[PDB]
Design a protein around this ligand. Structure first.
Ligand SMILES: CCCCCCCCCCCCCCCCCC(=O)OC[C@H](COP(=O)([O-])OCC[N+](C)(C)C)OC(=O)CCCCCCCCCCCCCCCCC
Ligand SMILES: CCCCCCCCCCCCCCCCCC(=O)OC[C@H](COP(=O)(O)OCCN)OC(=O)CCCCCCCCCCCCCCCCC
Ligand SMILES: CCCCCCCCCCCCCCCCCC(=O)OC[C@H](COP(=O)(O)OCCN)OC(=O)CCCCCCCCCCCCCCCCC
Ligand SMILES: CCCCCCCCCCCCO[C@@H]1O[C@H](CO)[C@@H](O[C@H]2O[C@H](CO)[C@@H](O)[C@H](O)[C@H]2O)[C@H](O)[C@H]1O
Ligand SMILES: CCCCCCCCCCCCO[C@@H]1O[C@H](CO)[C@@H](O[C@H]2O[C@H](CO)[C@@H](O)[C@H](O)[C@H]2O)[C@H](O)[C@H]1O
Ligand SMILES: CCCCCCCCCCCCO[C@@H]1O[C@H](CO)[C@@H](O[C@H]2O[C@H](CO)[C@@H](O)[C@H](O)[C@H]2O)[C@H](O)[C@H]1O
Lengths: 97, 459, 122, 171, 51, 60, 170, 108
């Protein structure tokens, strides 16, 4: 058949020794590096890591600890078991038979 | 979820209405902004899930998978734009559109309350994924890879549809919040055995379960880089996410029905890890590595313990970044030497010193060095399966040894030794490539500082 | 207590500082090996103080400074054990490592990656 | 592939090296080396070549029984402790092509001289290919031997990767 | 600006998405200040407990 | 392009009216039948979970 | 800074110095250097910061959850009641996890504090740890990853039936 | 004592009885082997030394190898199934009887 020959591979560095590898046009190439570095590293990674570091008591594990401290204090001051085996009051349960 | 659905949809007009030479800048920049806002999904509560509406919700399982999904889109754009540079403008925009449409289906899939809605979206991901592979793969057998990928999925997904519709008729609803309260035990009967298999086999194929895994290496060897990235990092986890949800309504039948799949997983992880020691295609080696890692996830889900579910969640996130990074590393070599043969280009640390460091870090996370979230997830599963049966520690420990062996074998073969004499086109690493590698590993390692956000609902 | 616990942690934090400076904050490539060797020699001195307090009165303590993760009923914290074995081993290890780095400054003098060699030893 | 003469001479050298590994001390080695030589000199003039092959075969059976299990190896020989030690520092010369212009500017004299070599290479290549065509029989080379240059101004065919190979101690 | 008008599309999509998420909560107010857990008396200047 | 949008909306609006009407009729039929046949739709007596027995299946 | 009843410590007994040597104690002079060179400048920075903090005193509160009916009082499939009971049970489950964590912290502090005498002197902590773990195990162990107040109740009723049978056979 | 070759330790060439009886047929075969090697060497060298070439010299032998290579199934599953099933039946039996110690076991 009639078909084009395979193109030869092109080295971005030959025309643009300063290439960042994003585009053959140097102005576009530089802009594309800047958005990736800014929106990728400066925003998402830096500010996103800061946002995660300061989440307000993620899934109440700090509240649970404070609440556990409040109950341990109360139960020991009143001679109660720290924890009971039964999760639910037996009086509210009607067993079969 | 509309604050994520709509701006994702708007990426399409952005790409089509951009100046010809700005399509990668604009799509990449704005997809990164969507990824930033995805962190608002971290408003999770200890008791209740974050229930937006009648259609969508987000708990601690879906949130990390959503963030990973939206993080992966800009990375795929960065990874794709070089080998698509000669493509004509319309076909470039169509390629970006497939990636955007994949994100749209994925974030809806991970947040649907009702299981039929999850099913339709779960199935819809097939279309852009198949089109990405068969249209933009390089080799002849991408056509076969598409058919294997398409028909493995539908061989399992059609029974799932029948089971889902059957469950709604019996229970009255498939809203996942309703199922949590109206779930009833599954008694022993041949009918329930096939209901169980219909509810599970579709997700097993996706993971993929050992013995249903041969589509995966075929798919990876044919896919373009973006295809492998999304496939390895997110699409496999659709099956993991599906199993974690649907096992709710399969007790207590999972007690004995899990055995044959646990055996396949426990033995399969050793088999696939060993196979990696003899793989000659770098992409095929990474594909088999995924099978081995996902075998742990299947075991974790099936034994259904709080520790195993936490490990499964961490493993799914950790594997997604690690495996995606490895395909990107493998692809960076390929874009120079145009071959996936692992033994072709050796001693690359001499020629590309900083890319050798990325290879080193990706390998270290792949073999689960403490305290990477890769090890955290693996360790939690190993902890929990020991209680399930102490003898499992033998298979778990042996798999750790083999994983270290093939992970470092990859590193030694490609990066160390002598360089191949006749390969004289190993040009210095581009800024784009270095940024791409660092945009995988840095967030992965930063997650070590705060693992709790990837441990899932059982945390 | 406060001198004992502060100085035992300073020993560890001091050793990591040459690794952090590799991020180029205040980095002198010209003699990085001398910099690494000096930190080892200073860490040895700082560790001899809590060792001396242990030898004197048998002072021992545990530092659980950072709560890293809680898995239901398993709380994981970064926790350091300044006891008999650590108080005696650390000064010895630092003293031996101090000699080896000084030896290394001569043995590996011609290695073009001598800087990386000292980072890896550290 | 090896002649009988080559096999005997290879065995003598191999036997002497293992004997030195055993003797260690120079005076002891000198004594036993001369005895070993006298064993080879005994059968030096054996003209019956079937007998000569028997002598060598038994000699190699003797060597295999008496060899040192841990013989001395020169440090940079294959199997020695410094073998390939410096390969990581060997960098092929084409890598300089990719240097940034600011890096090349640090060595203006070196890179001007490098351009002359690259010009010498380009202008010589066609004559090298032609010389090899003229001197290679129809079937192709029967051996790996390469010829010298035959005229003035010609370079020996296929010289670049020999002449410009990395230094043994490149850094 | 014909040069950069396309850069408001995804930001506007987010604002519209945010607004529609809020409008949907207005349809799910059947238990506002009525759950046994959180029900209370309204503060003097309060119309609704959340919106 | 304008007539394409207009034609779809015009036809779509009427199709949505009949759609919503047909579901209203279905519901009207269903509730009338339940009222006409109270013996087939008894108000079942509901137990609390303290009273109902559910087997426990340990996950060990 | 914390409740001494929740995280108790016994009164501390430090012996006085009793030198039997004329040589100076290096630790005593290093201690004085540490006070002058480390503690005082550290204390000066802290007091400046606290002075800024006193100009802006604002408060946060510990959230209080009213009690709602348990899963035992919920009619079958009544999701509105089940939901509130389920959420309450989940909050209690997290609290009980931290109660165990408090008791384990007490035990570990005693072990370190008592030194070579821990085996005898930490018996009271060991006993309290043993009991809370048993109660915690009874409530929550073996429920599985899909735990719920329903499954928790099913376990208690199974335990109650085994205890009723054993008492009857006696 | 003669050398016994093994799969992982070959017969030395100096001890191989076929290394000392080299006939005209054997020499002819060695020359044919050297000729094949030399022809491939030249074909490789004309590209490797070509100053205008930048890239990879594709090796059909390497391609054939990867192509050929890219082109005990229930027994261990059954074996492992009975190992874990037998272990878990034994363990479950003891817990129901109370004979398994789980005093401090509250993580799973
Ligand atoms: C020798 C040691 C060498 C080890 C490295 C240095 C150690 C430095 C640690 C100390 C630094 C201070 C510190 O820890 O910071 C405080 C914290 C950790 O400590 P913290 O939890 O106590 O928080 C401190 C603040 N308070 C006190 C209020 C709690 O740092 C973080 O939490 C950072 C979390 C980052 C994780 C999120 C990454 C963002 C990823 C964006 C998404 C895009 C990628 C997709 C991800 C996949 C989906 C999930
Ligand atoms: C053809 C194979 C179909 C298996 C038979 C399933 C079946 O027909 O069971 C009938 C039962 C409905 O009967 P019903 O009256 O509603 O309830 C009383 C239960 N006897 O149905 C049920 O109770 C459960 C129905 C679940 C739907 C099953 C879906 C197909 C199951 C076969 C595929 C499972 C294996 C998947 C293999 C994937 C391959 C990659
Ligand atoms: C088994 C566990 C193994 C763990 C392996 C984990 C691997 C991760 C890598 C290790 C990182 C080592 C450094 C960690 C210590 C530094 C981080 C830190 O301490 O800041 C957080 C701390 C919060 O304290 P905390 O209550 O314990 O945290 C609970 C939330 N997790 O904050 C504070 O309490 C005080 C913060 C204010 C500091 C004031 C002093 C400022 C000094 C100037 C800045 C330098
Ligand atoms: C009445 C109901 C229908 C409502 C329709 C509302 C939208 C109407 C849009 C009309 C304007 C279309 O604009 C016409 O098409 C495209 C994009 O716009 C422009 O041309 C385009 O070329 C390339 C893309 O191929 C890019 O540089 C850029 O996207 C744009 O310049 C044309 O130069 C313009 O003439
Ligand atoms: C990779 C695929 C893995 C596949 C794993 C296959 C697991 C096979 C499980 C076998 C058990 C099937 O479920 C079994 O069905 C029969 C239906 O007759 C039920 O038994 C029922 O029918 C039989 C008739 O023979 C009656 O004697 C019995 O009284 C009745 O209850 C059993 O109570 C149930 O245990
Ligand atoms: C709400 C958050 C939104 C964040 C969106 C981030 C997108 C960032 C994309 C930056 C790419 C800019 O890339 C390019 O830079 C300058 C902008 O003056 C312009 O480049 C040129 O355009 C014309 C002349 O041709 C001049 O007006 C301009 O001074 C000149 O620099 C291009 O028109 C623009 O395409």
């Amino acid at each position: 058949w009639q078909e084009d020959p395979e193109p030869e591979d092109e080295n971005l560095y030959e025309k643009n020794p300063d290439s960042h590898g994003y585009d053959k046009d140097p102005a576009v190439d530089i802009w594309n590096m800047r958005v990736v570095f800014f929106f990728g590293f400066s925003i998402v990674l830096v500010l996103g890591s800061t946002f995660v570091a300061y989440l307000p008591d993620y899934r109440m594990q700090e509240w649970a600890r404070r609440e556990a401290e409040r109950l341990v204090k109360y139960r020991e001051a009143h001679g109660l078991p720290i924890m009971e085996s039964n999760c639910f009051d037996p009086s509210k349960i009607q067993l079969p038979e | 979820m509309l604050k994520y659905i709509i701006p994702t949809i708007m990426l399409m007009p952005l790409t089509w209405l951009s100046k010809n030479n700005m399509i990668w800048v604009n799509s990449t920049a704005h997809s990164l902004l969507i990824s930033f806002t995805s962190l608002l999904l971290m408003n999770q509560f200890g008791d209740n899930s974050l229930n937006f509406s009648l259609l969508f919700f987000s708990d601690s399982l879906s949130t990390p998978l959503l963030i990973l999904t939206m993080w992966l889109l800009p990375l795929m754009l960065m990874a794709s734009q070089h080998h698509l540079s000669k493509e004509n403008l319309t076909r470039k925009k169509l390629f970006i559109t497939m990636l955007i449409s994949l994100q749209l289906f994925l974030i809806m899939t991970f947040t649907a309350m009702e299981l039929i809605l999850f099913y339709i979206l779960f199935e819809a991901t097939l279309v852009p994924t198949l089109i990405i592979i068969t249209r933009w793969g390089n080799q002849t057998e991408r056509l076969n890879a598409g058919l294997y990928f398409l028909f493995y999925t539908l061989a399992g997904s059609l029974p799932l549809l029948v089971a889902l519709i059957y469950i709604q008729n019996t229970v009255g609803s498939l809203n996942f919040l309703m199922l949590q309260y109206w779930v009833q035990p599954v008694h022993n009967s041949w009918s329930n055995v096939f209901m169980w298999l219909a509810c599970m086999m579709a997700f097993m194929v996706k993971m993929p379960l050992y013995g249903l895994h041969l589509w995966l290496p075929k798919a990876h060897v044919e896919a373009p880089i973006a295809g492998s990235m999304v496939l390895a990092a997110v699409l496999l986890k659709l099956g993991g996410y599906g199993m974690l949800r649907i096992t709710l309504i399969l007790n207590p039948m999972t007690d004995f029905m899990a055995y044959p799949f646990i055996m396949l997983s426990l033995w399969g992880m050793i088999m696939t890890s060993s196979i990696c020691l003899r793989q000659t295609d770098l992409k095929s080696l990474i594909a088999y590595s995924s099978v081995s890692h996902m075998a742990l996830v299947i075991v974790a889900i099936l034994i259904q313990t709080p520790w195993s579910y936490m490990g499964a969640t961490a493993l799914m996130i950790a594997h997604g970044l690690t495996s995606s990074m490895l395909f990107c590393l493998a692809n960076s070599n390929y874009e120079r030497i145009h071959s996936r043969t692992m033994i072709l280009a050796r001693g690359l640390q001499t020629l590309l010193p900083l890319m050798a460091t990325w290879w080193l870090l990706a390998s270290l996370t792949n073999l689960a060095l403490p305290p990477t979230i890769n090890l955290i997830g693996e360790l939690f599963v190993v902890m929990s399966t020991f209680s399930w049966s102490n003898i499992t520690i033998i298979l778990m420990g042996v798999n750790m040894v083999i994983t270290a062996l093939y992970s470092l074998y990859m590193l030694i073969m490609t990066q160390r030794g002598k360089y191949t004499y006749h390969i004289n086109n190993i040009s210095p690493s581009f800024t784009r490539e270095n940024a791409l590698m660092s945009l995988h590993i840095l967030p992965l390692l930063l997650l070590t500082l705060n693992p709790k956000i990837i441990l899932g609902p059982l945390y | 207590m406060n001198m004992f616990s502060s100085l035992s942690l300073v020993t560890l934090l001091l050793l990591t500082m040459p690794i952090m400076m590799m991020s180029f904050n205040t980095y002198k490539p010209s003699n990085y090996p001398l910099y690494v060797k000096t930190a080892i020699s200073y860490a040895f001195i700082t560790s001899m103080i809590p060792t001396m307090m242990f030898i004197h009165s048998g002072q021992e303590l545990i530092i659980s400074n950072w709560h890293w993760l809680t898995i239901q009923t398993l709380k994981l914290s970064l926790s350091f054990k300044m006891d008999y074995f650590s108080m005696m081993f650390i000064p010895v290890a630092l003293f031996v490592t101090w000699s080896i780095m000084e030896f290394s400054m001569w043995y590996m003098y011609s290695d073009p990656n001598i800087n990386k060699f000292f980072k890896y030893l550290l | 592939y090896l002649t009988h003469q080559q096999k005997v001479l290879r065995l003598y050298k191999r036997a002497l090296r293992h004997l030195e590994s055993w003797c260690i001390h120079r005076d002891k080695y000198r004594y036993f080396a001369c005895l070993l030589r006298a064993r080879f000199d005994e059968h030096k003039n054996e003209k019956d070549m079937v007998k000569a092959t028997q002598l060598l075969r038994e000699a190699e059976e003797e060597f295999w029984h008496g060899q040192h299990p841990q013989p001395y190896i020169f440090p940079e020989s294959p199997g020695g402790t410094s073998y390939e030690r410096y390969e990581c520092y060997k960098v092929p010369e084409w890598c300089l092509d990719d240097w940034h212009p600011s890096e090349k500017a640090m060595y203006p004299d070196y890179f001007a001289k490098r351009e002359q070599w690259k010009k010498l290479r380009r202008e010589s290549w066609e004559r090298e290919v032609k010389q090899l065509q003229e001197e290679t029989p129809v079937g192709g080379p029967r051996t790996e031997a390469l010829p010298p240059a035959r005229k003035q101004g010609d370079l020996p065919p296929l010289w670049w990767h020999i002449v410009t190979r990395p230094r043994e101690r490149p850094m | 600006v014909r040069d950069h008008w396309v850069h408001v599309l995804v930001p506007m999509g987010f604002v519209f998405g945010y607004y529609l998420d809020r409008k949907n909560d207005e349809k799910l107010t059947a238990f506002r200040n009525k759950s046994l857990l959180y029900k209370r008396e309204l503060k003097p200047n309060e119309e609704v407990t959340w919106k | 392009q304008l007539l394409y949008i207009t034609s779809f909306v015009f036809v779509g609006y009427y199709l949505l009216k009949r759609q919503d009407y047909m579901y209203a009729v279905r519901d009207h039929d269903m509730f009338s039948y339940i009222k006409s046949h109270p013996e087939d739709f008894p108000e079942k007596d509901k137990k609390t979970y303290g009273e109902v027995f559910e087997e426990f299946h340990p996950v060990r | 800074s914390w409740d001494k009843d929740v995280y108790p410590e016994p009164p501390r007994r430090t012996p006085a110095p009793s030198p039997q040597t004329s040589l100076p104690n290096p630790i005593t002079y290093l201690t004085k250097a540490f006070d002058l060179l480390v503690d005082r400048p550290v204390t000066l920075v802290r007091e400046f910061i606290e002075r800024q903090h006193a100009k802006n005193k604002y408060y946060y509160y510990h959230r209080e959850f009213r009690r709602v009916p348990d899963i035992t009082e919920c009619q079958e499939k009544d999701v509105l009641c089940m939901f509130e009971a389920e959420m309450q049970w989940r909050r209690d489950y997290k609290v009980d996890q931290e109660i165990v964590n408090i008791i384990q912290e007490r035990l570990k502090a005693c072990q370190q504090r008592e030194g070579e005498s821990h085996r005898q002197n930490c018996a009271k902590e060991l006993e309290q740890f043993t009991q809370v773990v048993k109660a915690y195990q009874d409530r929550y162990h073996d429920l599985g990853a899909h735990y719920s107040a329903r499954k928790c109740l099913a376990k208690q009723k199974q335990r109650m039936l085994a205890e009723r049978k054993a008492a009857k056979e006696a | 004592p003669k050398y016994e070759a093994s799969r992982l330790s070959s017969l030395p060439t100096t001890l191989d009885p076929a290394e000392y009886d080299i006939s005209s047929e054997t020499r002819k075969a060695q020359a044919e082997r050297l000729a094949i090697r030399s022809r491939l060497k030249r074909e490789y060298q004309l590209q490797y030394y070509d100053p205008s070439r930048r890239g990879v010299i594709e090796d059909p032998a390497l391609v054939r190898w990867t192509y050929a290579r890219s082109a005990f199934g229930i027994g261990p599953l059954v074996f492992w199934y009975y190992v874990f099933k037998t272990d878990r039946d034994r363990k479950e039996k003891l817990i129901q009887e109370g004979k398994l110690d789980r005093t401090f076991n509250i993580s799973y």
